[PDB]
Design a protein around this nucleic acid. Structure first.
Ligand SMILES: [Mg+2]
Ligand SMILES: [Mg+2]
Ligand code: NA
Ligand code: NA
Ligand code: NA
Ligand code: NA
Ligand code: NA
Ligand code: NA
Ligand code: NA
Ligand code: NA
Lengths: 144, 144, 144, 144, 144, 144, 144
RNA sequence: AAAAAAAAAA
RNA sequence: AAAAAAAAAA
RNA sequence: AAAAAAAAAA
RNA sequence: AAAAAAAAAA
RNA sequence: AAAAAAAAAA
RNA sequence: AAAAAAAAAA
RNA sequence: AAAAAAAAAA
RNA sequence: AAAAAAAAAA
RNA sequence: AAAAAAAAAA
RNA sequence: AAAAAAAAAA
RNA sequence: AAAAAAAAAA
RNA sequence: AAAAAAAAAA
RNA sequence: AAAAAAAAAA
RNA sequence: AAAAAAAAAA
């Protein structure tokens, strides 16, 4: 290969876009209480911490969740996810449980193409339930 | 295809990175004076305007340039690029000229793999010369 | 095949969901007046009568309609459907007529993938018009 | 694919059924005492919690069980299942044990086709024994 | 081929629809100011001028834009499009520029299937920016 | 497929037409008297009710007719069509009869290419005769 | 194909015939009384109503008949045909009956080649019997 | 797709 | 499955 | 026979 | 990849 | 190995 | 998929 | 030689 | 014979 | 893809 | 059509 | 040449 | 390369 | 079926 | 032998 700078025979000025879309897997944590659903805000996906503070909308594709702290004494970890949508919330409670008390529980869900519209900060993605006090989410999404 | 949310059988917690790299084509303009080289600052590539203000380093791959305003009376536009590097500046002056007085001049250069290291805001990419008072750059680069 | 109970060598606790989705064809009737459109409520789809009272959202895929009582004297039955959507109602009036005075008129429409989002009880599916005083609907849908 | 509503050329009124059957995997927990068999009631399978309160009968295909709390000090978990049938109970004691003290024990059994009749709320499915104070069941069944 | 009228052996009365959908490419112009975004109203698509005044909804598929008057002295034309959506506006600024001062700038964007829902008159399609005082749009859409 | 907006690399301004042609099947009814031919006006094809009020001309391709009310006591329905043309009316009487007293009679005719010129509101399409007091027409045509 | 008038290189004067033969299916009705045979006159085939008044002879090929009004109360329609010939009448009584009280009875017969000679107005085709007061005939014939 | 009648054609 | 009209596309 | 949803399986 | 249940389809 | 997004290329 | 034990079978 | 039940196995 | 740099070419 | 100039190489 | 980056997948 | 919408058709 | 119009031709 | 003139076209 | 119109037909 070349070891020196070389000319490019540029043509006409191209189509450009200073502010493109970005497909991402975004990791963050939420706090969860015993017996109580936590509504996960879409606003958590927009942050300098993820290089996403310039976006104000996102299309979520899938949500995965893991318990992030240990469960109560004698118990195995569990985590549940209930999808939420502006056009009508679901009542599914997708659940994983650990089979070793020292191991994370995990579960996820995929949003079908027909429900992949945009969401903004004030929207919620899902409800999380767990016997652990924190849950770690990884959300696959398209910032736009 | 599915019209409903469906379960994902998530496993162990994955490797994650909240602050990934990003390959980009960044468009911006510089002002140019008659007979004078303008040193293009790398700092212009880091901006909320490009969603890149969270980066402090970038690896430039190629630089393309177009004249952005009309040339002086009786003249055809030209633009020249001289690559700059922290380990030693080049003396190449890659040049394009217009063949229609109403048309942009354009030129570019490719940086070879052996010279693709990082640059930071206080570094310069290249010198630009032109008979036009503004030049439009599109820089292909890897933010990291 | 086996005539006795046999062991299953179960492994780890599986992903579970006590409240799954359900794809359905739901039959119900609506009352219709001469010259007047009836807005069919989505709420009619959630009922112990269909085993669906535990759902609060549904994604409608298609709607079929039949006249359910006889037409006025000297007339053949007709039925019309006009699709309604939260993002903008249609002005199509899909229509079937009977060709025997003793026979039901029927028609349907399919909702395209891009318009398959959720609806809730307060939403409406379509407008129905007919010269018959009842219309029988079968709605293909995905409870979630 | 289509982006708009389209006509369906419906024919005669179809065979319909507002209250269909449903094949399911139903997850629930039972309490278990040291040295004592717990009889698992079929009635637990009919609940708003599983969207199954409209059913009166169910045909069980298989039963799987996991210990759901930790075992006594110094011990590995175990779980046993004894199938019960209205025409004559079994005396099999299908058993799984854990091989790591921190891990669930599990086991299951399949009901052969010749014994897949209906059961109702009054009936029992099986006896459960364990050294753990709760057992998690997942029962594969056909509600009808 | 036949030079005379011939009989058609018609059967039963067909499904009919007096008010069908229509796929279209709609051309219209908007006024644009220096430094200021113009929100393009969906209402502009419904007009006797396009034979579309009987519709009240439309599904937009793509948007293309051209500058429609000359640019300021010394400049090349440019046009930018920012997609807008009821579920969350984008922050993309898709841009084209002219490479001859006497030529139109152009650019477009495609709306993905998952974002193709209906819009009505009070909704907006996109924001337009330009250095030219008028922009000509051609919008590909499905009236329904 | 893409889940986000994407750029279109538009070129020059295309040929456009804000008022295109439209191929249609137009359903409407006419009143018919015993023993008397009804001249069907072309003007009935231009209406807001069909989204066609912006047109001044139409090219008719074929005409189909069904009786639309019941026949007199003891009789089977019949319908006849006689094609009319500005260059010379036909004397054909294409006829269908019902073979069940409760069923519609139907018939149609095709216009050959050599006779497919435009017609305007003032013109007539055909004469209709029937023993029923209304006839339902579906006219296949090209609005231009 | 050609869009203009073109010369034909005509030769000698051809054989001509101002008054050709014509193969036809002629529809007409006859009145019928209970228990009485109606002799169908060949003369009915020659009429301005069929464009056949310039003919004085016809060769009949086949005869089909349908009841044309409803039958008496409690009855199904029937129609019978007895072929008549100048060289000797038949005694066949070809018969059709309806299987739905609302439907026409129908039947026909074919005349063999050896019996296809001419008939004139004063000749009869066949005898018709029915329980209905009118019978519709369609006669396939060669006017000459 | 084959036949008959009127027409047109290589 | 072929054709026409409106659109989109390599 | 192919697709979707719930389940079951190599 | 095969089977069962609900649906949809050539 | 196939798909999507940003870039680059024959 | 092959073997052993109990059963059933062409 | 094929199936079922208990076991054993690549 | 293949690669890189400057040039030239279908 | 082929040739020339500088270089590098099996 | 091939490569790189972010994601998703058998 | 392939897809979508309206129509027409074997 | 195929079609139409005028001409010419085996 | 080939050529020329006017036109239309992939 | 192919097409059009009326008819008849598998
Ligand atoms: Mg009937
Ligand atoms: Mg371990
Ligand atoms: Na940022
Ligand atoms: Na930023
Ligand atoms: Na219920
Ligand atoms: Na209930
Ligand atoms: Na319920
Ligand atoms: Na109009
Ligand atoms: Na209109
Ligand atoms: Na006459």
């Amino acid at each position: 290969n070349s070891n020196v700078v070389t000319m490019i025979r540029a043509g006409s000025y191209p189509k450009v876009n200073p502010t493109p879309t970005w497909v991402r897997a975004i990791p963050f944590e939420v706090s969860v209480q015993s017996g109580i659903a936590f509504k996960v805000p879409v606003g958590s996906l927009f942050s300098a911490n993820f290089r996403t503070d310039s976006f104000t909308s996102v299309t979520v594709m899938s949500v995965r969740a893991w318990t992030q702290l240990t469960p109560p004494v004698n118990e195995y970890s569990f985590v549940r996810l209930k999808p939420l949508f502006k056009t009508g919330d679901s009542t599914e409670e997708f659940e994983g449980r650990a089979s070793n008390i020292n191991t994370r529980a995990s579960v996820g869900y995929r949003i079908p193409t027909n429900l992949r519209q945009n969401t903004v900060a004030a929207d919620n993605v899902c409800e999380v339930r767990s016997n652990c006090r924190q849950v770690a989410l990884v959300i696959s999404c398209c910032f736009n």
